[model samples]
Target: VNSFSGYLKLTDNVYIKNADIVEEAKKVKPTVVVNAANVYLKHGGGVAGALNKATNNAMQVESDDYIATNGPLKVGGSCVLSGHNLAKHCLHVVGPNVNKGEDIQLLKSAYENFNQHEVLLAPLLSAGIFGADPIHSLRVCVDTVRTNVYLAVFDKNLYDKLVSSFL
Candidate 1:
């Protein structure tokens, strides 16, 4: 299987591609990477945990220290973090949770904040444990992005949904 599976061009300077989030982030070394993080900013599970594993706990200490100093980040909020052994830096966003009654506006806000970077690598925010609506995730990503982006997708089902939505 091709890990760098395919892509869709959305603009002259923007596009979304299908690839493993961890692999591409490690390989491309984009300017900024985004993680669909929890409010506590713990890299315990989901994508955060995976990344922590990838970096071999390289970021967990600093990640804890960030929240320790800044307090728990709120939904729709984000904080810049060390990419450590991966990209230049990581943006940890507390993406909306549908189960918590959070909506698309929050997710859009999360994507918009990432516009600060010219090269961004981001996951399908809120679509996992947060129970985000995938199309909403796709729309916000495609509509709000102002940089070259990779929609880091890990599973075939979610990737299929995003692919169909884009096509």
Candidate 2:
């Protein structure tokens, strides 16, 4: 059980956290790390950007391959990369565009695609670019993920908000 920095225990295996995704990736070394990607699998921004940079663009290369074979990733769809630096595997999920108010269900669907694993690390899907409220995103994530899940929050203010709002 984590002590500090505030975490909400969703279940025996699920949790919402206020911390750096990269740090959690290092500490837990999850079996798989899930990135909130786009239809093109472009790691140009948000969690995808940071994760892509952290893995030296290996995720981009893999995602590109998936696109080459399957075409653009559908929102709520996902693809995987094996043996990445941060985890044994990586799952890229394309969430919906929130500006259109069509992302919540799709975000839930994206998370539903995650296969069972011992541990999984992820950011708040569709929360940033898609404009999802962190608290709402946390609820959806906790509801969807099956394994021990870590939801990372980089901004301290947002973290505090999450901790207060949820706890």
Candidate 3:
């Protein structure tokens, strides 16, 4: 288990694997925890490549939603992404620098402010499936709150192990 210090406080946080978030959402105990895996892409693929819908359509798909975001604009006019990023819907936000920590905070906070306890099925932060160096986005997405986090991992073996360990 990747244990971190308690200094990092969380409103609600739990590590899950090979489970269901939607079902777990229905059963709310004192602390609700749902673990799931293989939630990204269709027919299995890499994290960066999870945005490809054609692959998903051909391979059979899952999940109710997959929201993603990134920096700047690109060629196909909201279709062809600039960096290695993908979402069912992509929004463009201009910034001095896309990797700024503020963006992450704002994204999470905005998500919470607007949705009101809505569960966001999102990929780790990315650079719009066209750019490079997406750590900033990833880091921001990793540190949000007031919403259930469903990380769509592509690796089934690791996903099973993680859910099993959590169980």
Please name the candidate that would achieve the greatest TM-score relative to the true structure. Answer: 1
Q: Is candidate 1 or candidate 2 better by TM-score?
A: 1
Best by lDDT: 1
TM-score per candidate: 0.87, 0.84, 0.30
Which tens-of-lDDT digit does each residue in 20-104 have in candidate 3?
2222223322121211112222223333233333333422222212312332232211121121122222222221123333233
Report the candidate with higher lDDT, 2 versus 3.
Answer: 2
Models sorted by TM-score, best on top: 1, 2, 3
Between candidates 1 and 3, which one is better according to TM-score? Answer: 1
Candidate 2 lDDT over 1-167, as tens digits, reads 43224566657666666777766776667777888778888889788888888888887888788779889878898877763787788777777778766647777887787645556777877887778777887777777877677778888888778777763
Q: Give each model's whole-structure lDDT.
A: 0.77, 0.75, 0.29
Off by more than 4 A, model 2: 1-8
Candidate 1's displacement at residue 22, Å, is: 1.0
Residue 145 CA displacement from its true place in model 3, Å: 2.9
Tens-place lDDT per residue, model 1, 51-151, is: 88888987788888987898899888888888887779999888887877886578888777777876777887888778887777877777777776767
**Clash totals for all candidate models:** 0, 0, 12
* Candidate 2 backbone collisions, by pair: none
